[PDB]
Every structure is written in C-alpha cells, then in structure tokens.
Amino acid sequence: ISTIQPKANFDAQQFAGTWLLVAVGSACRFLQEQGHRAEATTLHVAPQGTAMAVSTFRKLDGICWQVRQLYGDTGVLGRFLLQARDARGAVHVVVAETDYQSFAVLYLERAGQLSVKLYARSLPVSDSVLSGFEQRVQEAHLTEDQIFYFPKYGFCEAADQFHVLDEV
Amino acid sequence: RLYYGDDEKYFRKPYNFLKYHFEALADTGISSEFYDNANDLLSKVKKDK
C-alpha cells in the first residue's frame, strides 16, 4: 500500500446507497488513449456487513451492464481487497476521504498501479470538493493530463438478468 | 475499462478430427393447428288427438 489511510472511523452504513462517478485520475492509459467513450458510471453500494456489495452500472455501447463486486473487507476499517478475482489481481481499495451525504474519494491500488476516483451523491460536485480531489491527485503524483472527467448524463440503473456480469 | 478478455481465442484441434468447423446456426420451425367442429341437430314432433 502507498502512504494512504482510510477515512477515520469509516461507516459502511452511511457510505451505502448510490454514488455517481465524477472523475478518475489514473496512470491507466486506457483512459489516456480513447478516454472518450467512457460512459457515465454509477455505483450502487450496500453493506455486505464487513464487505460492501458494489454494483457498478454502465451503458456498454448502450447496453446497461451491472457489475456486482464484493469490496471484501481487508481487516482494516475502510480498506478492501476485491477478492483478487483473476489475473486482474487483488485491487486494494481505500475510502480515503468522504462526507457520506455528498461526496467520497476512493483510492484503488494495484501492483505498480494507483488510481483515485471522485464520487458524488449528486451532480455537479462542489468546487471545493473538486479542487480537494485535484490536490489528492497531486499528492498521488499524477498530472492534470491523467485526470479524466466522466459525463454527467445517461446513468443506467437496472441492468437486466443477462447484462449482469456478477464478478463477485 | 469494461472490455472483452482475449483468452480462449483458439483451441487446438485433436488429430482425430478432419474438421471442427465451429459454425453457429439456429433454425426454428413452428406449426400450430386448431380445428373445431360442432354438428348439433335437434329434431322433434309432438302430436295430440
């Protein structure tokens, strides 16, 4: 893990409910090269007790796709592992900063890879939160070229029976 | 990134197959038939003297 720590006394309960992905600062060139065509990503969250049920939804080519992932508890309040589903590896996710009624900042780290996400309960996000997240990006040593903003419309709750990836 | 994993792209054909073609087809044929008949015939005489 990088020099990062969770939200103090993180509460899975209040963090529960829908979150909208605002922006992702990442070294992953996938957002760099063809960072356009990244759909408005919504993230329904529910306390799986210690774990969190985390259903990402997207419009993959306009197909509404739910991807249900367990953010499994690592054993530290506000840090999660996501099973290590496959050669995707373990993904160390930390809720670094949030107020549960408007915004949260999540850190996601993989071997040689760090990524930070800004989520908001509603859109637009406050400018103070925006610039705070941009500071978090500087503290992650990422550049402005490595911040990618996700469109504000076309959120797609309710993937059907079949467009549900259910990675677990 | 939501994307397609490139694993399993090819399979090795065992020697005992001259071909293994992997062509995908569906055919659906349906026939439904209904026939009903009734033939009702009341016939009567009544008489008195």
PDB file of C-alpha atoms in Angstrom, chain A residues 15-134:
ATOM      1  CA  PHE A  15     -21.483   5.264   2.715  1.00  0.00           C
ATOM      2  CA  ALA A  16     -24.218   2.899   1.473  1.00  0.00           C
ATOM      3  CA  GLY A  17     -26.511   3.920  -1.366  1.00  0.00           C
ATOM      4  CA  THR A  18     -25.877   5.218  -4.864  1.00  0.00           C
ATOM      5  CA  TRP A  19     -22.720   7.084  -5.830  1.00  0.00           C
ATOM      6  CA  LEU A  20     -22.004   8.800  -9.154  1.00  0.00           C
ATOM      7  CA  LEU A  21     -18.507   8.563 -10.612  1.00  0.00           C
ATOM      8  CA  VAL A  22     -17.376  12.129 -11.357  1.00  0.00           C
ATOM      9  CA  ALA A  23     -13.707  11.801 -12.290  1.00  0.00           C
ATOM     10  CA  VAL A  24     -10.855   9.285 -12.244  1.00  0.00           C
ATOM     11  CA  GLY A  25      -7.184  10.186 -12.020  1.00  0.00           C
ATOM     12  CA  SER A  26      -5.231   7.169 -13.200  1.00  0.00           C
ATOM     13  CA  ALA A  27      -1.952   6.058 -14.726  1.00  0.00           C
ATOM     14  CA  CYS A  28      -4.011   3.608 -16.822  1.00  0.00           C
ATOM     15  CA  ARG A  29      -3.520   4.791 -20.411  1.00  0.00           C
ATOM     16  CA  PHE A  30      -6.876   3.209 -21.317  1.00  0.00           C
ATOM     17  CA  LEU A  31      -8.397   6.481 -20.110  1.00  0.00           C
ATOM     18  CA  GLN A  32      -5.499   8.334 -21.760  1.00  0.00           C
ATOM     19  CA  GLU A  33      -5.860   6.774 -25.235  1.00  0.00           C
ATOM     20  CA  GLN A  34      -9.588   6.686 -26.020  1.00  0.00           C
ATOM     21  CA  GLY A  35     -10.576   8.333 -22.767  1.00  0.00           C
ATOM     22  CA  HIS A  36     -13.592   9.475 -24.719  1.00  0.00           C
ATOM     23  CA  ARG A  37     -16.247   6.763 -24.883  1.00  0.00           C
ATOM     24  CA  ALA A  38     -16.262   6.251 -21.132  1.00  0.00           C
ATOM     25  CA  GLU A  39     -19.909   6.183 -20.080  1.00  0.00           C
ATOM     26  CA  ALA A  40     -21.451   7.822 -17.028  1.00  0.00           C
ATOM     27  CA  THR A  41     -20.623   5.285 -14.311  1.00  0.00           C
ATOM     28  CA  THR A  42     -22.951   4.851 -11.326  1.00  0.00           C
ATOM     29  CA  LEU A  43     -22.025   2.809  -8.256  1.00  0.00           C
ATOM     30  CA  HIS A  44     -24.778   1.421  -6.048  1.00  0.00           C
ATOM     31  CA  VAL A  45     -23.231   0.396  -2.717  1.00  0.00           C
ATOM     32  CA  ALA A  46     -24.700  -1.755   0.064  1.00  0.00           C
ATOM     33  CA  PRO A  47     -23.129  -3.021   3.316  1.00  0.00           C
ATOM     34  CA  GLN A  48     -22.429  -6.734   2.871  1.00  0.00           C
ATOM     35  CA  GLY A  49     -21.730  -6.390   6.571  1.00  0.00           C
ATOM     36  CA  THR A  50     -17.946  -6.016   6.651  1.00  0.00           C
ATOM     37  CA  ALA A  51     -17.799  -6.310   2.860  1.00  0.00           C
ATOM     38  CA  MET A  52     -19.683  -3.984   0.513  1.00  0.00           C
ATOM     39  CA  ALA A  53     -21.872  -5.083  -2.344  1.00  0.00           C
ATOM     40  CA  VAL A  54     -20.704  -2.712  -5.102  1.00  0.00           C
ATOM     41  CA  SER A  55     -22.780  -2.782  -8.320  1.00  0.00           C
ATOM     42  CA  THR A  56     -21.189  -0.640 -10.995  1.00  0.00           C
ATOM     43  CA  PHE A  57     -23.596   0.153 -13.840  1.00  0.00           C
ATOM     44  CA  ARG A  58     -22.594   1.343 -17.315  1.00  0.00           C
ATOM     45  CA  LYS A  59     -24.045   1.707 -20.808  1.00  0.00           C
ATOM     46  CA  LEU A  60     -21.640  -0.592 -22.606  1.00  0.00           C
ATOM     47  CA  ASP A  61     -22.452   0.513 -26.187  1.00  0.00           C
ATOM     48  CA  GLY A  62     -25.820   1.462 -24.692  1.00  0.00           C
ATOM     49  CA  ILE A  63     -26.241  -1.964 -23.082  1.00  0.00           C
ATOM     50  CA  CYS A  64     -26.982  -1.362 -19.386  1.00  0.00           C
ATOM     51  CA  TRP A  65     -24.369  -3.520 -17.556  1.00  0.00           C
ATOM     52  CA  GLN A  66     -24.363  -4.159 -13.789  1.00  0.00           C
ATOM     53  CA  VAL A  67     -21.018  -5.462 -12.460  1.00  0.00           C
ATOM     54  CA  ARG A  68     -21.612  -6.675  -8.873  1.00  0.00           C
ATOM     55  CA  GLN A  69     -18.294  -6.806  -6.960  1.00  0.00           C
ATOM     56  CA  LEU A  70     -17.622  -7.604  -3.317  1.00  0.00           C
ATOM     57  CA  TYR A  71     -15.279  -4.969  -1.939  1.00  0.00           C
ATOM     58  CA  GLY A  72     -14.270  -7.569   0.631  1.00  0.00           C
ATOM     59  CA  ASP A  73     -13.012  -6.286   3.971  1.00  0.00           C
ATOM     60  CA  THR A  74      -9.216  -6.455   4.205  1.00  0.00           C
ATOM     61  CA  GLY A  75      -9.401  -6.293   8.010  1.00  0.00           C
ATOM     62  CA  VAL A  76      -8.923  -2.518   8.335  1.00  0.00           C
ATOM     63  CA  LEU A  77     -11.940  -0.251   8.653  1.00  0.00           C
ATOM     64  CA  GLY A  78     -12.334   1.338   5.224  1.00  0.00           C
ATOM     65  CA  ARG A  79      -9.887  -0.838   3.269  1.00  0.00           C
ATOM     66  CA  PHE A  80     -10.938  -3.528   0.805  1.00  0.00           C
ATOM     67  CA  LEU A  81      -9.383  -6.160  -1.451  1.00  0.00           C
ATOM     68  CA  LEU A  82     -11.968  -7.163  -4.114  1.00  0.00           C
ATOM     69  CA  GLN A  83     -11.124 -10.879  -3.857  1.00  0.00           C
ATOM     70  CA  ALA A  84      -8.327 -10.833  -6.421  1.00  0.00           C
ATOM     71  CA  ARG A  85     -10.904 -12.101  -8.927  1.00  0.00           C
ATOM     72  CA  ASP A  86      -8.327 -13.204 -11.512  1.00  0.00           C
ATOM     73  CA  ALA A  87      -5.084 -12.093 -13.181  1.00  0.00           C
ATOM     74  CA  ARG A  88      -6.720  -8.703 -12.684  1.00  0.00           C
ATOM     75  CA  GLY A  89      -5.139  -9.381  -9.277  1.00  0.00           C
ATOM     76  CA  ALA A  90      -6.031  -8.060  -5.861  1.00  0.00           C
ATOM     77  CA  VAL A  91      -7.178  -4.437  -6.032  1.00  0.00           C
ATOM     78  CA  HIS A  92      -6.553  -2.608  -2.752  1.00  0.00           C
ATOM     79  CA  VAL A  93      -9.363  -0.054  -2.392  1.00  0.00           C
ATOM     80  CA  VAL A  94      -9.307   2.603   0.339  1.00  0.00           C
ATOM     81  CA  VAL A  95     -12.058   5.101   1.136  1.00  0.00           C
ATOM     82  CA  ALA A  96      -9.630   7.946   1.767  1.00  0.00           C
ATOM     83  CA  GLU A  97     -11.936  10.937   2.255  1.00  0.00           C
ATOM     84  CA  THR A  98     -15.692  11.435   2.289  1.00  0.00           C
ATOM     85  CA  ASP A  99     -18.731  13.047   3.769  1.00  0.00           C
ATOM     86  CA  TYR A 100     -21.372  10.403   3.277  1.00  0.00           C
ATOM     87  CA  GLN A 101     -24.158  12.772   2.160  1.00  0.00           C
ATOM     88  CA  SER A 102     -22.399  14.435  -0.797  1.00  0.00           C
ATOM     89  CA  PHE A 103     -19.019  13.074  -1.903  1.00  0.00           C
ATOM     90  CA  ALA A 104     -16.365  10.424  -1.412  1.00  0.00           C
ATOM     91  CA  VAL A 105     -12.815   9.898  -2.659  1.00  0.00           C
ATOM     92  CA  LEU A 106     -11.687   6.296  -3.165  1.00  0.00           C
ATOM     93  CA  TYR A 107      -8.100   5.172  -3.694  1.00  0.00           C
ATOM     94  CA  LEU A 108      -7.611   1.974  -5.703  1.00  0.00           C
ATOM     95  CA  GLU A 109      -4.127   0.463  -5.872  1.00  0.00           C
ATOM     96  CA  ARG A 110      -2.782  -2.489  -7.839  1.00  0.00           C
ATOM     97  CA  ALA A 111       0.767  -3.797  -8.229  1.00  0.00           C
ATOM     98  CA  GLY A 112       2.585  -0.857  -9.827  1.00  0.00           C
ATOM     99  CA  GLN A 113      -0.742   0.923 -10.383  1.00  0.00           C
ATOM    100  CA  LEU A 114      -2.583   3.577  -8.387  1.00  0.00           C
ATOM    101  CA  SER A 115      -5.933   5.132  -9.290  1.00  0.00           C
ATOM    102  CA  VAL A 116      -8.146   7.625  -7.456  1.00  0.00           C
ATOM    103  CA  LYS A 117     -11.860   8.229  -8.029  1.00  0.00           C
ATOM    104  CA  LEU A 118     -14.143  11.116  -7.108  1.00  0.00           C
ATOM    105  CA  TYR A 119     -17.730  10.080  -6.369  1.00  0.00           C
ATOM    106  CA  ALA A 120     -20.706  12.295  -5.575  1.00  0.00           C
ATOM    107  CA  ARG A 121     -24.227  11.655  -4.336  1.00  0.00           C
ATOM    108  CA  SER A 122     -25.450  14.260  -6.833  1.00  0.00           C
ATOM    109  CA  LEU A 123     -24.124  16.294  -9.730  1.00  0.00           C
ATOM    110  CA  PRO A 124     -22.473  18.799 -10.117  1.00  0.00           C
ATOM    111  CA  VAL A 125     -20.000  18.316  -7.271  1.00  0.00           C
ATOM    112  CA  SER A 126     -18.896  21.294  -5.198  1.00  0.00           C
ATOM    113  CA  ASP A 127     -15.836  23.159  -6.468  1.00  0.00           C
ATOM    114  CA  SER A 128     -14.207  22.791  -3.043  1.00  0.00           C
ATOM    115  CA  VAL A 129     -14.508  19.002  -3.329  1.00  0.00           C
ATOM    116  CA  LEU A 130     -13.271  19.169  -6.931  1.00  0.00           C
ATOM    117  CA  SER A 131     -10.106  21.100  -6.022  1.00  0.00           C
ATOM    118  CA  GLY A 132      -9.586  18.895  -2.966  1.00  0.00           C
ATOM    119  CA  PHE A 133      -9.641  15.835  -5.213  1.00  0.00           C
ATOM    120  CA  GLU A 134      -7.266  17.584  -7.633  1.00  0.00           C
TER     121      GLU A 134
END
